[PDB]
Design a protein around this nucleic acid. Structure first.
Lengths: 24, 141, 60, 124
RNA sequence: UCUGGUCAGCAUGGCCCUUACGGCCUGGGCGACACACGUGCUACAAUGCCCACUACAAAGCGAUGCCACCCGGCAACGGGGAGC
RNA sequence: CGCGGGGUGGAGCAGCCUGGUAGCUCGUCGGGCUCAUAACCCGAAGGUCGUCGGUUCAAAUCCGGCCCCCGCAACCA
RNA sequence: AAUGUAG
């Protein structure tokens, strides 16, 4: 959830991007 | 004070004193002995007293070897009581001593100090004593 | 340690990281708006004297 | 279905089953399924004896893996008993090694609360 | 009203330090940890969780700045580079 | 000396005639309630069973030995 | 359903 840094919502809540949240 | 750590039995019969010493009759350790000239029970308090005097004399000096050990219990009924009603309570302990037993022994000392020390001790003992050397006490081959 | 501080903040020697902000009226270092250059007290006190152009009491 | 030593998944979709290995998570899983070319929606229940060997080939050979992976990290924590780095301690006192607030939490590295206290204030 | 808070934002009566209670710097500390309390965040799951596709906001903010868009990289980010 | 009783968490008492589970009340600690302190509520901690042996597979318990504390008896003369 | 140190 809102802290699983390996996820959609994990990056969202943190406000950063990576593999698990592709930058555009 | 000076007693066994355990005994098989707490009280024991008085018995007797046939002559001789059986053993413990020759020197073996130190270079001067105090020997018994009469049988007796010697009490721990006497042994100790003598021993202390020995040391006190050649204060903290040589070595001492106490060759009798009070294993025998010494009973005594309460004061003022009449006869019967079992054996008495144990008051102390004795060492059975018989003529020619080498009770003490000393090492690392002058003959003068030794001679004297022992004499002194002989006084604390309730029997007659003699001083000894290291003669034909060498039971070897 | 006030005065010597406000004077050390003036000059920009040594490693640009250290070039921190410092209130202009007040000796202040914490809670200074880069825009005004002023402490949050400093600010609010001037505001009230009109001495800040176009700067008004908000109300929405 | 005993790929890694004491480890055996079954009757679950293989994709996450492989998670049930120390040294294997969602990543090293998917990575291996394309390379073995097997549908992960399929269960450990059902597959060729060839599929099985094909999978254990790729995995056990590539990386490691319970046992000597587990045994490896330990020797690294062990080596921080050199002359004794900062990360060496914290391992020595079982405290957070990664720069944190001990004053409050840390309970994950510290076994539940040893309340133990007897502090005083005014009687008279 | 609370001899409420603030002399440590600043001001200020007095007291006190004036090769130091001033001043310069390196390094540390303020981040310590057997514990306890406050304000909080994330959860314990199926009215859920995950992955692919697709919509509808407002209020702000931006030049030794926000970065379109291309390219390297799993990605953080790093090269190029249009507009402001 | 002569008999008989006791010794267990910090206090006061169970458990021992009927070996295998140390229980209870108060108190202590941590958290609640109060502006605060009692009272009350929640949850914990704490005993080498005076002591050394013996029996038993196993001893607070059964068996002795020493160390303490309390109770009775000491009459006919 | 007790209590609240001196000035």
């Amino acid at each position: 959830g809102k802290g699983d840094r390996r996820t959609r919502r994990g990056k969202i809540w943190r406000g950063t991007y990576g593999k698990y949240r592709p930058r555009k | 004070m000076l007693m066994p750590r355990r005994m098989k039995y707490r009280k024991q019969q008085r018995g007797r004193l046939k002559g001789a010493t059986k053993g413990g009759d020759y020197v073996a350790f130190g270079d001067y002995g105090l020997v018994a000239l009469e049988p007796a029970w010697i009490t721990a308090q006497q042994i100790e007293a003598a021993r202390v005097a020995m040391v006190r004399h050649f204060r903290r000096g040589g070595k001492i070897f106490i060759r009798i050990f009070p294993d025998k219990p010494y009973t005594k009924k309460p004061l003022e009581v009449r006869m019967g009603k079992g054996k008495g309570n144990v008051e102390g302990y004795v060492a059975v001593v018989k003529p020619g037993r080498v009770m003490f022994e000393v090492a690392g000392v002058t003959e003068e100090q030794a001679m004297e020390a022992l004499r002194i001790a002989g006084h604390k003992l309730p029997i007659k004593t003699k001083i000894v050397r290291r003669d034909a006490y060498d039971e070897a081959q | 340690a006030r005065k010597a501080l406000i004077e050390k903040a003036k000059r920009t020697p040594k490693f640009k990281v250290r070039a921190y902000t410092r209130c202009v009226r007040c000796g202040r270092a914490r809670s200074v708006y880069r825009f005004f250059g002023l402490c949050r007290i400093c600010l609010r006190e001037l505001a009230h004297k009109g001495q800040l152009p176009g700067v008004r009491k908000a109300s929405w | 279905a005993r790929i890694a030593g004491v480890e055996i998944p079954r009757n679950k979709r293989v994709d996450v089953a492989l998670t049930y290995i120390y040294g294997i998570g969602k990543a090293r899983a998917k990575e291996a399924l394309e390379k073995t070319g097997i549908n992960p929606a399929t269960r450990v229940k059902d597959l060729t004896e060839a599929e099985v060997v094909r999978l254990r080939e790729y995995v056990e050979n590539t990386w490691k893996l319970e046992g000597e992976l587990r045994a490896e990290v330990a020797a690294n924590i062990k080596r921080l008993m050199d002359i004794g780095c900062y990360r060496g301690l914290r391992h020595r006192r079982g405290l957070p090694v990664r720069g944190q607030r001990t004053r409050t939490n840390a309970r994950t590295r510290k076994g539940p609360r040893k309340t133990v206290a007897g502090k005083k204030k005014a009687p008279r």
